[PDB]
Design a protein around this ligand. Structure first.
Ligand SMILES: Nc1nc2c(ncn2[C@@H]2O[C@H](COP(=O)(O)O)[C@@H](OP(=O)(O)OC[C@H]3O[C@@H](n4cnc5c(N)ncnc54)[C@H](O)[C@@H]3O)[C@H]2O)c(=O)[nH]1
Ligand code: MN
Length: 1095
DNA sequence: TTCAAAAGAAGCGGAGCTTC
């Protein structure tokens, strides 16, 4: 009751009665919200928020008074104050648009007159804003406090939303657009990553608006109003921004991108401010005024980010104590601007940085259309990073006279998969350009003697930055390779940088000099290396040289290796010992390092081993079809085409096939994580078509530079030796493209057969519009699938071990089955409650359920063990936010458009998510979390998931701790964790209660293709409990292996580069033994440990 | 079926079916 009259005192004039049982118009704003116990927003109570905040922003003194702080961010100066004054005036224009739009709505279809007569329009999907209007003579008007506060939220969102949007990948776009991921057109993914979907824009706006309103949700009010009213407000604000042209709306017709797709999709992009707009130096003034506890802000000095209580976008999952400890540790690290790189970036200038690191200026007619779109996407990313960096620098520069002395902190959160992610799009963790200007690494080195350990550290940092693969060679060999480079190709660049570090000037051909010197080594960190070595050369005191140059301790094929260690469940095999050594687990070799292994024992890493296995599987494939000439020809053409355009595939003069580890890197990784072969085939083809489109721009360029040039020379000039030698390359290309688009392999009854597509590639090539589309793309993909990817998959399995593949399958099925039941039961418990609501006369279809009701439903699922617990991490595989549960609109704008589906936090099918969740989570996730919290945890590093940047002073000890953290994570047992959860599930699940849809989904996972079709609940049930037994057995094995492995002498250098391996000090000595001998000895220990328990 | 975040628009009518 105190709450009712409390919220009424604040909004006494809103239309309707604050009682859900009342007969006439009811006010769902006061029913849905209460005043907080403690102030959240300084606009609560204000009769004119826009006037008050504008006043607050009008001077430093007034701002300080308003926020009740004694001092304001020094970035808030005259120039910035003047810009905010102009932005407040614009807030008035947004407010004015909103008021007119309301008046239009009230007048159309006499909604206002009807509402006044008792028609409950304030409950319509388009009428929820009527809960915040006030009667005004013969009509209605917005409550000014609520209206103007939402506008302030709208201005803040307008300033910073773009910079906080999620990144879209091909997967996201395919889901959005309904177009198969493998067939997405060029630049479509780019078009979609640039804008916001309606849901994306509205939900971020709504969150901000509700935040500024500064109220609390009533647990017993229907979500249709608690979420609905601020969403209706957001929708209206987005619409006003479209009217004001602060936001551009683009309705994308899928019909032209695919004749059969009927979706039309809205894209919303915020009009960018000028890069030199003063407000960029301090874009959060409003947020920091309105909110008592601002979320959008920079953390300078000893202003430390708070620790997140719950997993990112998974509010049902609390960050564990150990996770919070890790977050705290990472949020405490101080970052500092490295002034020389900033000055270098600035002196080069945005345009030359793009020429150097992007695609420079685009001549949209020396470029193939499709290529042109990738180039644009490239520039976008570098340009945004540049602009974002310098906005941050502008704000840092205000904090002090020496920007290199201003400490900077970053907020972090744990993601769904256990990774510690730095919040924001453009920060050191996520943006390479920013990574080289803002660093937590720093050291003072004695470089007066090139025989110091300090100089050796310095060399290692330069080499790694320069794309020398420092983990494949010893420190000594590295040193000689680096010296060769600095005295050879890099010298002209080094000389230029010496000059720059002397006078502060660059030549006009700087881009050329860098580009030529670096060649393929070019990167932002390479620039840091040139900068730092040249700074050392001109340094006055080489004996105390200060530098943020770092060495990254980086995982060697980290995910696959972790999966092999964590989820291989059988006896030990020699192949496993050899392969796992490729990832830094050395048995019976005290103090062995990855550098030594690679140089003296085995130069092939796990990607190369898989690639070599691929070549065998391919050789086998060729045999089974040896007499079938058309099939041999089809394979040769695929191999030929890839050879023309991909560096990783080489065909020799006499036909010798050679493959670089590169083509196996991504396919190995994602295959373990549950990717299908088709998806991989599609990716390989993309890399082929990308290269082709690019070669077409080469044609246009060479052809324009010389109209005489022959087609062959224009397309294979750079790639060939002679004229006629380029004429055969052209012949291969045209033959390959034709056979690969007109003929596809299919698998009928275990055998491959060629079929005509009837849609072969035909016609003269026009290098500008040339596009491999639809039916042609699919054909290329089918060829790639059967003649390359399928043998690759065979190679992968032989490499990582069939035992691991088996474990990931049981893990996948268990977590899928569980997610299906969870999803289905949730939806059912929801439909039950809504049927109870039709009995309620206070309730209307569209109101949905209360939070309290949703909470009770979620709690009722606890006996199905939705959460996986390791003791230090919590995983919620099924957790999601979906439109499928409520299946209805939440709100629209006042024009009956911008219809936002009602989204609910609820479990959904996992699919294959179980694998990467557990592998990433208990692998690199657990390693980094351990690294942050362990005794003697390395200080002043930047952690990037499976690699860690270390200052040059501490590379040895930090690397050793990193490898100890790896070993610690290898004591994990993610299958055991899944088993514990799945066995509780199996004890409580009622398969008979599931919908038939749920039931068949489970059949797919638990039952062979055959026994499905028409199996009973009991067949499903019995099959589901077999998986539990499988899990139990795997988990037992994993546990034994780990204990046995711990008894033996191990050297671990998975976090490689520095050559500082962790020794487990196992007492049983397996040195001077072959992998076969070692496997036998480990299997004895395994059997003996299996008996300790059996008895 | 790789993971790390979801996600059509809009007339009529007042939800939800319909057509593009
Ligand atoms: N889950 C995931 N992680 C990704 C993906 N792309 C990149 N990452 C992570 O970021 C670094 C690279 O950051 P950068 O700014 O230096 O480029 C990357 O390191 P690695 O390339 O060495 O891979 C380490 C482990 O990450 C997982 N992983 C990589 N790539 C993928 C993909 N495509 N899909 C799933 N998982 C991936 C593996 O466990 C790998 O061993 C990553 O740490 C990304 O798309 N997804
Ligand atoms: Mn790595």
């Amino acid at each position: 009751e105190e709450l009712k009259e409390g919220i009424d005192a604040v909004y006494p004039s809103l239309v309707g009665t604050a009682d859900s049982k009342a007969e006439g118009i009811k006010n769902y704003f006061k029913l849905s919200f209460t005043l907080p116990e403690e102030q959240k927003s300084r606009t609560v109570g204000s009769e004119a928020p826009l006037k008050d905040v504008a006043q607050a922003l009008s001077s430093r003194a007034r701002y300080e008074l308003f926020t009740e702080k004694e001092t304001a961010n020094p970035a808030f100066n005259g120039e910035v104050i003047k810009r905010y004054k102009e932005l407040m005036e614009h807030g008035e224009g947004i407010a004015d648009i909103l008021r007119s739009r309301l008046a239009k709505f009230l007048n159309t279809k006499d909604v206002g007159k009807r509402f006044a007569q008792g028609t409950e329009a304030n409950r319509w999907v388009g009428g929820k804003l009527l809960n915040i209007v006030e009667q005004d003579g013969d009509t209605f008007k917005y409550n000014e406090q609520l209206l103007q506060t939402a506008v302030l939220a709208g201005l803040q969102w307008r300033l910073t939303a773009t910079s906080n949007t999620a990144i879209k990948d091909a997967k996201d776009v395919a889901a959005i657009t309904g177009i198969d991921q493998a067939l997405l057109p060029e630049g479509l993914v780019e078009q979609f990553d640039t804008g916001m979907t309606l849901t994306e824009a509205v939900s971020s706006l709504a969150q901000k608006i509700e935040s500024y309103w500064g109220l609390s949700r009533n647990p017993n009010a229907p979500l249709g109003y608690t979420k609905g009213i601020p969403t209706a407000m957001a929708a209206e604000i987005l619409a006003a921004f479209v009217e004001s042209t602060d936001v551009v709306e683009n309705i994308v017709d899928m019909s032209e991108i695919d004749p059969d797709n009927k979706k039309t999709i809205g894209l919303y992009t915020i009009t960018e401010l000028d890069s030199f707009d003063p407000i960029n130096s301090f874009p959060t003034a409003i947020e920091e005024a309105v909110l008592v506890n601002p979320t959008e802000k920079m953390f300078f000095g000893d202003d430390i980010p708070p620790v997140a209580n719950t997993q990112l976008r998974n509010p049902a999952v609390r960050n564990t104590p150990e996770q919070k400890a890790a977050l705290k540790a990472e949020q405490a690290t101080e970052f500092y601007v490295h002034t020389p790189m900033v000055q270098f970036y600035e002196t080069l200038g945005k345009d030359r940085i793009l020429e150097l690191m992007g695609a420079g200026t685009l001549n949209k007619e020396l470029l193939n259309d499709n290529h042109a779109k990738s180039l644009e996407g490239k520039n976008r990313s570098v340009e945004d990073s540049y602009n974002q960096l310098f906005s941050v620098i502008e704000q840092v520069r205000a904090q002090s006279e020496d920007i290199s002395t201003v400490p900077i902190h970053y907020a972090y959160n744990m993601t769904r998969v256990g990774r510690m992610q730095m919040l924001g799009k453009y920060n050191p963790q996520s943006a390479k350009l920013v990574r080289e200007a803002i660093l937590p690494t720093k050291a003072t080195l004695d470089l007066s003697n090139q025989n110091n350990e300090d100089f050796s550290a310095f060399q290692l940092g330069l080499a790694q930055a320069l794309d020398i693969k420092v983990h494949t060679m010893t420190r000594e060999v590295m040193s000689d390779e680096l010296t060769k480079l600095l005295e050879g190709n890099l010298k002209p660049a080094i000389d230029m940088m010496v000059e720059f570090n002397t006078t502060g000037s660059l030549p006009e051909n700087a881009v050329d000099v860098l580009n030529t010197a670096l060649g393929d080594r070019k990167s932002f960190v390479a620039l840091m290396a040139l900068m730092e070595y040249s700074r050392y050369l001109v340094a006055e005191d080489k004996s105390a040289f200060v530098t943020p140059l770092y060495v990254e301790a980086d995982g060697v094929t980290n995910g696959p290796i972790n999966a092999m260690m964590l989820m291989t469940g059988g006896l030990f095999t020699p192949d496993w010992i050899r392969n796992i050594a490729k990832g830094g687990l050395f048995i019976g070799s005290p103090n062995k390092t990855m550098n030594e292994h690679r140089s003296t024992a085995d130069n092939n890493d796990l990607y190369q081993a898989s690639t070599n296995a691929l070549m065998e599987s391919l050789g086998k494939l060729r045999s089974n079809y040896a007499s079938n000439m058309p099939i041999q020809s089809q394979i040769d053409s695929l191999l030929s085409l890839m050879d023309l355009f991909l560096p990783d595939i080489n065909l020799g003069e006499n036909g010798a096939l050679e493959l670089k580890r590169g083509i196996a890197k991504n396919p190995l990784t994602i295959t373990i994580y549950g990717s299908g072969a088709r998806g991989i085939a599609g990716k390989l083809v993309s890399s082929v078509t990308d290269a082709i489109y690019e070669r077409m721009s080469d044609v246009l360029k060479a052809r324009a530079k010389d109209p005489n040039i022959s087609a062959a020379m224009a397309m294979f000039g750079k790639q060939a030796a002679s004229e006629a030698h380029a004429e055969e390359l052209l012949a291969r290309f045209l033959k390959d493209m034709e056979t690969l688009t007109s003929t596809v392999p299919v698998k009928r009854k275990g055998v491959l057969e060629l079929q005509s597509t009837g849609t072969g590639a035909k016609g003269k090539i026009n290098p500008k519009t040339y596009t491999i589309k639809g039916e042609q793309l699919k054909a290329l993909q089918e060829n790639m699938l059967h003649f390359f990817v399928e043998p690759l998959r065979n190679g992968i399995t032989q490499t990582v071990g069939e035992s691991l593949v088996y474990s990931t399958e049981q893990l996948q099925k268990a977590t899928q089955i569980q997610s299906v039941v969870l999803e289905d039961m949730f939806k059912q418990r929801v439909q039950e409650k809504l049927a109870e609501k039709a009995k309620d006369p206070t309730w209307k279809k569209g109101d949905f359920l209360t939070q309290k009701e949703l909470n009770d439903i979620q709690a009722s699922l606890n006996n199905l063990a939705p959460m996986i617990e390791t003791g230090s991490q919590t995983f919620y595989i099924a957790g999601s936010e979906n439109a499928e549960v409520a299946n209805q609109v939440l709100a629209t704008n006042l024009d009956d458009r911008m219809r936002v589906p009602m989204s609910i936090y609820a479990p959904a099918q996992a699919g294959v998510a179980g694998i990467p969740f557990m592998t990433i989570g208990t692998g690199d996730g657990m390693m980094m979390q351990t690294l942050s919290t362990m005794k003697g945890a390395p200080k002043n590093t930047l952690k990037i998931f499976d690699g860690m940047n270390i200052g040059l002073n501490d590379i040895t000890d930090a690397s050793r701790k990193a490898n100890e953290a790896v070993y610690t994570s290898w004591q994990g047992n993610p299958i055991k964790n899944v088993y514990e959860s799945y066995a509780k599930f199996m004890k409580n699940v009622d398969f008979s209660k599931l919908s038939p849809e749920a039931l068949e989904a489970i059949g797919k996972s638990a039952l062979e293709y055959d026994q499905r079709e028409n199996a009973t609940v009991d067949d499903i049930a019995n099959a589901a409990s077999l998986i539990e037994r499988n899990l139990r057995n795997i988990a037992l094995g994993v546990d034994i292996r780990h204990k046995v492995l711990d008894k033996v002498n191990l050297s671990i250098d998975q976090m490689a580069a520095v050559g500082a391996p962790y020794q487990n000090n196992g007492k049983i000595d397996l040195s001077n033994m072959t992998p076969e001998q070692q496997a036998d000895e480990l299997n004895k220990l395994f059997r003996e440990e299996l008996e300790a328990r059996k008895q």
